[PDB]
Amino acid sequence: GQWLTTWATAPQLVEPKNLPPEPGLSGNTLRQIVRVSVGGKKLRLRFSNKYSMDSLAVKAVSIAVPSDSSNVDAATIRSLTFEKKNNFKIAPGSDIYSDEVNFNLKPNSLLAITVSYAKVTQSVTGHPASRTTSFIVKGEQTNAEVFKNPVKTDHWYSLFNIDVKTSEPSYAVAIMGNSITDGRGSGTNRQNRWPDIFSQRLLANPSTRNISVLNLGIGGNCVVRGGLGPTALDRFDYNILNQQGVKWLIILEGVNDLGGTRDPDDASKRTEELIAAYQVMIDKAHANGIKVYGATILPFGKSFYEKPFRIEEWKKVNDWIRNSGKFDAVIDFAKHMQSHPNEAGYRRMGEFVDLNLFKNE
Ligand SMILES: [Cl-]
Ligand SMILES: [Cl-]
Ligand SMILES: [Cl-]
């Protein structure tokens, strides 16, 4: 069997305001819920400490099928091991995969990942915009069926990705983006970001049954410089080339590169740098056997449009995506729009993606 990454999130350094509420992670247990795409019977999970400056010390990890919110089906709970060990402690900047574990993972299903921490500092790697409630209880409760009075926090910590073993040809679509991809305005706990809607359509169609979708969106992200979280260029290798089975990359990013410009000259400079960055990413993906699909968008909100040079430059970017011939194909969301992000808009976007782009090889 070969590994395929079925779920991912893009890690970053957690800002102070996005650290969990009391009692905190230190010495406590955190239960987190994710939606997988392709299913299977043998799994492994990777945890990331990539952006922290302190060690990540974990006493135990389990996986289970959720029942309702913070509870799990007790008969499904399985412990992870790390080179046989219950626990791990990994250096600043490192990550770790669990050993393989037998686990019946249904496609398009929710998985509860429960982590019991040792000492945790204020320097933590995670994904704040989870769009999903996580649950904290005191002490070591990795295998507790029912969490009593858990503290709720709508953030993810430590997670990176889940891989499944496959026997049939199976491949992943990775999606690099900002908050439009990460799911701003999607429904909390609903797992209804546009990549989830697209993922469900792949799984419901026989010719794309073995195609997973990896959400590498980060809210506020920029491609070239600035923004929130590591830039797309800086996280490209770690997020896109570091998974299992990636065959396609969708790029939906760049608006924030222009949204922060304050004069027309800087807007022009950031537009040129963004177009150069697209080519660097296309070339890197091609070198690794990955096709790249460029996605257009119209900027959301009013703050982008209060200075007119921004939209005039953004129209040039959309035109380059459409007409430069550098992308292997184009997903023209902007044109479809013209025919604030929210759940209905993500349903529309997810239904628009052409499944025929995910069928060759
Ligand atoms: Cl969660
Ligand atoms: Cl994903
Ligand atoms: Cl954003």
Numbering used by the authors: 11 to 349, 366 to 387
How does the study describe this entry?
Acetyl xylan esterases (AcXE) that target mono- or doubly acetylated Xylp are well characterized; however, the previously studied AcXE from Flavobacterium johnsoniae (FjoAcXE) was the first to remove the acetyl group from 2-O-MeGlcpA-3-O-acetyl-substituted Xylp units, yet structural characteristics of these enzymes remain unspecified. All homologs were confirmed to release acetate from 2-O-MeGlcpA-3-O-acetyl-substituted xylan, and the crystal structures point to key structural elements that might serve as defining features of this unclassified carbohydrate esterase family. Enzymes comprised two domains: N-terminal CBM domain and a C-terminal SGNH domain. In FjoAcXE and all studied homologs, the sequence motif around the catalytic serine is Gly-Asn-Ser-Ile (GNSI), which differs from other SGNH hydrolases.
The crystal structure of CspAcXE was solved in the native state (1.30 Å). The sequence identity between the CspAcXE and PbeAcXE is 52.4%. Both comprise an N-terminal CBM-like domain consisting of three antiparallel β-sheets, and a C-terminal SGNH domain where the central β-sheet comprises five parallel β-strands flanked on both sides with α-helices. In both cases, the CBM-like and catalytic SGNH domains are tightly packed and connected through a loop of six to seven amino acids. The residues forming the CBM-like domains in PbeAcXE and CspAcXE are 1–175 and 1–176, respectively, whereas residues forming the SGNH domain in PbeAcXE and CspAcXE are 180–385 and 181–386, respectively. The first seven N-terminal residues of PbeAcXE and the first 10 residues of CspAcXE did not have electron density and so were not included in the final structures. Moreover, residues 350 to 365 in CspAcXE, which form a loop next to the active site, had unclear or missing electron density and so were omitted from the solved structure; this could be the result of the absence of ligand to stabilize its conformation, or due to the absence of many crystal packing contacts in this region of the protein. The Ser-Asp-His catalytic triad is formed by Ser188, Asp363, and His366 in PbeAcXE, and Ser189, Asp363, and His366 in CspAcXE. In CspAcXE, these residues are Ser189, Gly229 and Asn266. Therefore, like the GDSL-hydrolases, the GNSI-AcXEs do not have the nucleophilic elbow; this is corroborated by the crystal structures of PbeAcXE and CspAcXE, which show that the Asn in this motif (Asn187 and Asn188) are buried into the interior of the enzymes.
